[PDB]
Write a protein that binds this ligand. Structure first.
Ligand code: NA
Lengths: 410, 410
């Protein structure tokens, strides 16, 4: 039989059923309405799979998208691919304890204390065991968003390659907080040959105090880069400085955000460029010298890309993993072509990148930036809070199998 | 004093004055009006400079821009940087004979039969030591457009690093035809670590029958790539196949060209996607299999970039070296970010790339695609014809020091 939340059977004993915070197609909408607790069967691991008892789960805006069914209903998408399930168990971040392994799992063991990286693909696909990068495979996707059986169940299912050793000095909730956003940032900063962060490179980080940005600042700093954070208030600015940013830029000081004027609109271009230059000058002011960012860590998309493209150094890279302000990103070729800049899409993580990121966490070089811990019961409200901009600063987590806060250190 | 066009002094004897097809600021406008023949003082080569007697000169659209003063007048622009000259001698492609060398020239000698690559920068600038590539330096620019003393004078001036050995099996006019566009295309296809043409890569080449496109097709084929040419009519298409394109696509079959609808415009995006999809299927048809181009060789810019970004393979690169239809390039982040695509600006060439490209010419692996030969007297009319619909497929040249056609083979 199932067990209560905040408890588990003996290690390696798996119940038939589990509790999960579930979405169904018939209740898509706001998170408060779309999420409901249900009991479902615990899945059995197949070849190469690992069943993890979730001790804590991290929250992400991807769960707001899955709850709303925008841009897609994930359930309907998987049904079109042959899935029998009519529910979605999200959650893309977890810490916990391995409770079962399938055939061919020769490294990970029952009882291991682990975290889960989000880079999901079929380990047995031809393109995965060959092509450039497993994240380019046909099967590549984000665990717990594109896949079912994520961290909002008492037990989650992942492939072996997603399993990482849990940092010993972190609690369950601390360890559950950063991996999705941290590995995403790590691939962005270290994954694109020709434009990886080097010592003394200036790195412009949008949304510096958010989950992605706070990991990016730390990763850049550990690489010997000089991070500059863009933020929405002074407190967030000082938070970013405390994580290693040399300084911050307050976005509210500018009003040019959005799609730029067409290149033929001379009057509009004059006004837009004066704003962009002023933004660039604040970078110079923080550095104490006229240097441009070699790497720009993007994610706002439509409203910021024009500034990113403009400020990026000659021969530099704007790398982007979302479009939170919209997807119609205008690239002015008079900057992008003549000064030979790179606009790089980046998504997920491969295993080498995830392990390298996790090694920084494990060694105590990176802070997981846990802001806020909620109960399993509050997944819907917590994502409602997220959508309404109301979460405390910091990555947010829920307890699942953990009986209380501040457990799990070794 | 000066010698006639179609003649030279003995090798190494430099006259005081030379004929040139010159633009002046008081006559900017259409090429037919802007270019006029004048005599000017032959420049004295300074440190690191080489004076080349021009035997033939290649034509390029950059000369139409210079004639018009778009985006700026190059004469006024150089005067603001300290230049004394009130005239512009364009021409960014030359074959000829070295007639003089300045101080500190190491390898190039008087009498050498040469061609000139377009990658111009100050060899004694710090950054040309400390930037990652000399084309990223502050002084990096295009010879004969951004610089004076190009190939439309009887003698032209270049830095030593621009000098290449002229292919022995080519005439003066053949050898003068391809270097600007060929080296540009070489840098695009081989110069961007992470996304260089590999055996069996599909390569989509815009404007296939043009100078750049016809070199790109051949470069891609030499690297074991599979080129697909976009063209404006059937004959251009067949021309592209004879250079090694597996097949061609006629752009006039397609009414979606231009800036795309905004991402929130549902109905606009259905129609736009249907055409982009059909464009994609033409690729697959030519290939006989459902594969996407790993590399897209761009330059039309504004009107084609949405299609390029859409068709580009997961993890692939769209590389762009102009914006002939305009500069406001809209990148849909739903393709670009999620399928991890690269949009790479590229401009000019470094010396390693230029030599590698020229090696292909020298060894007879690449055709310079000489389409038409005109007289020095007709620079203005030839660029007028270029600006209008006229001029043949591939590359046009003029004779300068060569007394007649088909000379210069060794
Ligand atoms: Na020129």
């Amino acid at each position: 039989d199932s067990v209560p939340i905040g408890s588990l059977p003996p290690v390696g004993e798996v119940p038939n059923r589990m509790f999960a915070q579930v979405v169904r197609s018939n209740r898509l909408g706001d998170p408060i309405d779309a999420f409901q607790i249900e009991q479902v069967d615990v899945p059995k691991p197949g070849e190469g799979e690992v069943l993890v008892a979730v001790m804590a789960a991290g929250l992400n805006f991807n769960n707001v998208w899955a709850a709303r069914g925008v841009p897609i209903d994930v359930i309907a998408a998987r049904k079109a691919q042959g899935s029998p399930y009519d529910f979605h168990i999200g959650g893309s971040d977890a810490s916990g304890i391995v409770y079962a392994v399938g055939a061919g799992v020769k490294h990970v063991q029952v009882g291991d204390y682990v975290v889960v990286h989000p880079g999901y693909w079929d380990p047995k696909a031809p393109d995965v065991v060959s092509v450039r990068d497993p994240m380019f495979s046909a099967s590549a996707q984000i665990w717990g968003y594109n896949t079912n059986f994520g961290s909002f169940g008492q037990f989650c299912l992942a492939y072996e390659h997603q399993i990482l050793p849990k940092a010993k000095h972190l609690t369950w909730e601390e360890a559950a907080a950063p991996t999705l956003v941290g590995t995403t940032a790590y691939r962005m900063l270290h994954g694109w040959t020709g434009h990886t962060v080097e010592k003394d490179d200036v790195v412009l980080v949008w949304g510096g105090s958010g989950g992605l940005g706070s990991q990016a600042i730390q990763i850049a700093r550990e690489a010997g880069g000089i991070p500059i954070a863009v933020v929405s208030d002074a407190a967030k600015g000082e938070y970013c400085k405390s994580l290693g940013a040399k300084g911050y830029i307050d976005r509210r000081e500018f009003n040019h955000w959005g799609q730029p004027p067409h290149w033929t609109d001379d009057a509009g271009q004059k006004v837009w460029t004066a704003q962009a230059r002023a933004f660039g000058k604040k970078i110079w002011d923080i550095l104490g010298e006229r240097r441009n960012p070699r790497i720009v860590l993007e994610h706002p998309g439509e409203d910021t890309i024009p500034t990113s493209i403009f400020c990026c150094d000659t021969g530099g890279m704007v790398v982007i993993c979302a479009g939170t302000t919209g997807y119609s990103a205008v690239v002015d070729l008079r900057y992008h072509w003549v000064r030979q800049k790179r606009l790089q899409g980046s998504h997920g993580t491969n295993t080498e990148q995830a392990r390298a990121y996790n090694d920084l966490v494990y060694s105590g070089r990176i802070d997981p930036c846990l802001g806020e811990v909620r109960s399993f019961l509050d997944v819907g409200k917590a994502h409602q809070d997220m959508m309404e901009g109301k979460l405390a600063h910091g990555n947010t987590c829920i307890l699942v199998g953990a009986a209380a806060k501040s457990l799990g250190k070794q």
